[PDB]
């Protein structure tokens, strides 16, 4: 286990045996792909192979090393104000959680229909000094599950978190990080959906009807400062203890908007990665 | 234990067995609620149920995960002065401890008549720079049990804490946190009370007559600085190792003042969460 | 307490590290995990399923479907050539393919590969193509003889319909790079007529062949990296 | 190394914590500890020794010693009253007492208490006082009958000389506060004449009684806090 796990030799690939010639009836190279199945032909079948003892692991080819990597999914921003502190809808951010506000990562999942996992969120606040001294800028990142008082503005009553989660980070002390259980009323997170809100010819249809997980509200606790700032707290996300069901063809058209498939670009012709050839005859 | 505790499957709910029809005498659906008791009827009784093996824990529905969550209960503030340092009643705060200076959390308890627990207090000081440089602003949070010299002003003799508790936090070093034993002369903390100070038709009556636990005095040790500041040291509180006796109906009227029940708003009609319907016939 | 020394790396953050974190939401018992038909556990699996190849990688064709078919024609001449593509699995036409699309998520690739072709011809129709794998070393062959000299497979179109051509693994370095590299050049594969396309009366004289590529149990990838085949020259709205 | 997480409280300082610290002066072997008659181990001990009570807590008397004696007088009337003090052990006259002085170092007190009185009268002299403990509930009694109704002890002055009155513990809350509090009101104790002070010829007709208070094995305190009974409206020089 160790060795196999430390040496990373858990999932090893078979070796290529030796072959000889075949002047025989059954032709393995011939199958009818219309059966929708996949051929099973190998080196050893087609050629006169040798003998190679392999040693490549398919460890890094696991839904956990494919998925289990932190990725920017949101960049909370706060261009502070000292003029009007508080006021409605200010100096405090509110974001509705989702993995598709950022291509990159959105891409990656979408490779599967259904997914499930415990998520680890890492917060990277970066304090840009627009003043001659930033002081001590404390911070509060509160997680607001669906149906909850979302701060109208900066000091509501909701920042008491008498029963909510608020992580606090003060300049110097390291990056805040915290794990979260799989949050879904469903056995898995719906990476896609072919459902609607209802029969209302004005109902919603997508990966939204289904996943409404709440929001994350940022505040900069410290009160009024003298010299201004702008805070940019980056939100990275990692999938630990993941499972995936029914793979899908990757995406080749740059999306737009989330919780939707829509590609149809603003005017520009729909562009894809495929390149053009002069002729099939020469590559 | 582990698994059950790590998997959080300690308090599990029964499953819904299978039923068949009943053309029989005893009618479980009929009971007389006037007995003040509660009915005992179930799915299986009323319908022709199936068979569902459950898997929901009532772990998070425990007075400890209901109560055991940190909540703002006080926001100590100090608008420093350099003009007059010391002086009487300045640059040092004094707060008399209580869980009801902040709705949110006050709310939550009040759900029960009596309560008991060890409390963990977390201090979140936030230093707002009103100057061009905040220096090194050290801090002293002293706990003054009842009947003790409460600092008249900033440097008394009481800040020696020869036999008191004073926690010190210096800009950079993390949030101060400390636990405290259940402090009451009584077997439990009186969430409510129907007693008075005495027969004096001018005596006190409430949750105050009873709980007078002392005070917490804040000081900013550092001496005189050049560039001003304002400190806001937030006081969060968590209930660990809690017990509760005799539940009560939640609160629906926004209170005012603490250690009292009084709702009667200043002029405004008493408002509650209930919404109005046009008709009972359609919901 | 424990006289400790804080090591250099301490306090950092890596988008690639295995560490635990206090779980907010203590005491939460997640929805049970019901049974669901078809769950993956390894990219590999997806890599072994043959996805179709854009090969008619030509002009107007390209934004359409045709971009997938290869019509086997007339051919006045004989021993003439059909097409060619190069093996470097991250190279349009290959790239876009379930495999390619993927491989482009890792820095290095290896093993054998499988190319399969199917005759969307007729029943009464007949043909015989010669497919070949020209290992890395020289130039994609101008002529059949020259190409027949290396690895190949004669394909007899018949009641079967699908011929699968294997691409052995020939390389110096146990491993090849997924990224365009003169060194790690995997070679070319091409197809030519062995005989012709003969059709008895009143049958069309052009017909198509679809082509595909799935992996071999040989196969394996490594060094995950972010893809090539997708530039989000966005953003993304709401 | 050990993937560690630094917890909130970390780096703080508490005037009340048990932690180790590198000892400067390594290798120092302190002077041996010779034997010394009388060493304490518990405040309690000090609390069980009866210290004298200032009770003649009156005007000019106060800065002097008298402030300690209570002269038992004439009394033309009969069944008249001597003095009273209240039990709340942090209340002058009590407070200053070895006990009081102490208790004022803790937030809460409990148990029974002991009051002792001594006759500095004469030998040929005689008397009989009635002492009483009036539990918390009402007002310090105006009359003897009213007070005799609760807890008390008739004291026959004689060859003995010291009568000790116990103050049972009557309270709702297992514990009482050391700080003045209407709730935690312990009550009053008072003294009256049962008979008189009779003296045969040519003996003085006023005499004194000293009074004291020591603890009971009942007794116990908690929640240490800084004292009341001492304001250093100094500083202190050199």
């Amino acid at each position: 286990n160790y060795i196999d796990e430390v040496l990373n030799e858990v999932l090893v690939v078979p070796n290529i045996k030796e072959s000889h010639h075949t002047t025989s009836n059954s032709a393995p190279l011939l199958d009818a792909a219309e059966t929708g199945h996949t051929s099973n032909v190998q080196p050893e079948d087609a050629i006169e192979t040798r003998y190679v003892i392999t040693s490549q692991t398919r460890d890094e080819m696991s839904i956990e090393s494919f998925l289990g990597r932190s990725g920017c999914v949101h960049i909370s921003r706060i261009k502070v104000d000292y003029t009007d502190y508080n006021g409605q809808d200010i100096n405090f951010t509110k974001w509705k959680i989702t993995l598709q506000e950022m291509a990159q990562i959105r891409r990656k999942f979408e490779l599967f229909t259904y997914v499930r996992f415990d998520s680890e969120i890492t917060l990277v606040p970066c304090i840009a000094g627009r003043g001659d001294d930033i002081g001590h800028i404390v911070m509060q990142y509160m997680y607001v599950p669906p149906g909850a008082p979302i701060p109208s503005k900066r000091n509501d009553f909701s920042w008491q978190s008498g029963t909510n989660m608020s992580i606090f980070w003060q300049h110097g002390q390291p990056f805040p990080r915290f794990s979260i259980p799989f949050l879904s009323i469903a056995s898995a997170y719906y990476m896609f959906y072919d459902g609607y809100d209802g029969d209302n010819t004005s109902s919603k249809y997508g990966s939204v009807v289904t996943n409404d997980m709440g929001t994350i509200c940022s505040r900069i606790v410290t009160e009024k400062q003298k010299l201004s700032v702008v805070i940019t707290t980056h939100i990275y996300h990692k999938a630990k203890h993941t499972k995936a069901w029914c793979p899908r063809p990757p995406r080749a058209v740059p999306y737009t908007h989330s919780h939707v498939t829509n590609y149809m670009p603003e005017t520009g012709d729909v562009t894809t990665a495929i390149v053009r050839r002069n002729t099939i005859t020469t590559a | 234990n582990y698994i059950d505790e790590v998997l959080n499957e300690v308090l599990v709910v029964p499953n819904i067995k299978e039923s068949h029809h009943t053309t029989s005498n005893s009618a479980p659906l009929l009971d007389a609620a006037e007995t003040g008791h509660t009915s005992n009827v179930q799915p299986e009784d009323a319908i022709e149920t199936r068979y569902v093996i459950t898997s929901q824990t009532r772990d998070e529905m425990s007075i400890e995960s209901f109560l055991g969550r940190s909540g703002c209960v006080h926001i100590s503030r100090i608008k420093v002065d350099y003009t007059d340092y010391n002086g009487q009643d300045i640059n040092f705060t004094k707060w008399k401890i209580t869980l009801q200076e902040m709705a949110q959390i006050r709310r939550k308890f009040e759900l029960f008549t009596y309560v008991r627990f060890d409390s963990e207090i977390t201090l979140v000081p936030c230093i707002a720079g009103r100057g061009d440089d905040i220096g090194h602003i050290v801090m002293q949070y002293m706990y003054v049990p009842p009947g003790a010299p409460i600092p008249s002003k900033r440097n008394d003799f009481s800040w020696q804490s020869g036999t008191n508790m004073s926690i010190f936090w210096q800009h950079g070093q993390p949030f101060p946190r400390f636990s405290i034993p259940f402090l009451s002369i009584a077997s439990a903390y009186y969430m409510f009370y129907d007693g008075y100070d005495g027969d004096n038709t001018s005596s006190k009556y409430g949750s105050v007559v009873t709980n007078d636990m002392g005070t917490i005095c804040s000081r900013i040790v550092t001496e005189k600085q050049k560039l001003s500041v304002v400190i806001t040291t937030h006081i969060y509180h968590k209930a660990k190792h809690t017990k509760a006796w005799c539940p009560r109906p939640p609160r629906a009227v926004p209170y005012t003042h603490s250690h009292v029940t009084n709702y009667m708003p200043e002029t405004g009609d008493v408002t509650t969460a209930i919404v109005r319907r046009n008709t009972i016939t359609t919901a | 307490g424990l006289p400790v020394y804080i090591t250099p790396g301490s306090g950092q953050f890596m988008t690639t590290d295995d560490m635990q974190s206090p779980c907010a939401l203590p005491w939460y018992h997640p929805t049970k995990e019901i049974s669901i038909p078809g769950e993956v556990k390894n990219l590999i699996e997806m890599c072994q399923v043959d996805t179709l190849i854009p090969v008619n990688n030509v002009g107007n064709n390209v934004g359409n479907v045709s971009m997938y078919t290869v019509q086997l024609g007339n051919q006045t001449g004989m021993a003439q050539k059909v097409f060619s593509i190069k093996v470097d699995i991250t190279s349009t036409p290959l790239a876009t393919t379930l495999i390619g699309e993927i491989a482009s998520y890792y820095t290095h690739w290896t093993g054998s590969l499988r190319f399969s072709f199917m005759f969307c011809g007729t029943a009464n129709t007949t043909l015989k193509l010669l497919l070949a794998y020209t290992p890395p070393g020289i130039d994609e062959p101008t002529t059949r003889k020259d190409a027949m000299l290396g690895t190949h497979v004669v394909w007899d179109v018949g009641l079967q319909s699908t011929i699968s051509l294997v691409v052995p693994w020939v390389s110096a370095s146990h491993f090849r790079l997924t990224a365009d590299n003169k060194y790690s050049m995997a070679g070319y594969i091409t197809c030519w007529y062995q005989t012709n396309l003969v059709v008895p009366p009143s049958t069309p004289q052009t017909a198509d062949m679809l082509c595909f590529v799935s992996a071999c149990k040989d196969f394996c990838l490594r060094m995950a990296r972010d893809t090539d085949l997708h530039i989000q020259s966005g953003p993304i709205e709401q | 190394g050990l993937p560690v997480y630094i917890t909130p409280g970390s780096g703080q300082f508490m005037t009340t914590d048990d932690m180790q610290s590198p000892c400067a002066l390594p290798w120092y072997h302190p002077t041996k500890e010779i034997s010394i008659p009388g060493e304490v181990k518990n405040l309690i001990e000090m609390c069980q020794v009866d210290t004298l009570i200032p009770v003649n807590n009156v005007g000019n008397n106060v800065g002097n010693v008298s402030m300690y004696t209570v002269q038992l007088g004439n009394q033309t009337g009969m069944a008249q009253k001597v003095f009273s003090i209240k039990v709340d052990i942090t209340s002058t006259p009590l407070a200053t007492t070895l006990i009081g002085e102490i208790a004022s170092y803790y937030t809460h007190w409990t148990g029974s208490l002991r009051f002792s009185f001594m006759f500095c009268g004469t030998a040929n002299t005689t008397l009989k006082l009635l002492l009483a403990y009036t539990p918390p509930g009402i007002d310090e009694p105006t009359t003897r009958k009213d007070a005799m109704l609760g807890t008390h002890v008739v004291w026959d002055v004689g060859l003995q000389s010291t009568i000790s009155l116990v103050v049972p513990w009557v309270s709702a809350s297992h514990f009482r506060l050391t700080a003045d509090n209407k709730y935690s009101m312990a009550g009053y104790i008072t003294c009256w004449y049962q008979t008189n002070l009779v003296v045969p010829p040519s003996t003085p007709q006023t005499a004194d009684m000293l009074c004291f208070v020591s603890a009971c094995k009942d007794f116990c305190l908690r929640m240490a806090r800084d004292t009341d009974l001492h304001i250093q409206s100094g500083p202190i020089e050199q």
């Binding site: 460890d59 979260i180 630990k240 | 790590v6 | 295995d18 | -």
Partner: peptide, 19 residues
Amino acid sequence: YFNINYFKDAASSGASRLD
């Protein structure tokens, strides 16, 4: 060094294993 789930909940733990 391992299996020392310093934290209570399971959601908090390292990247799972492989089998």
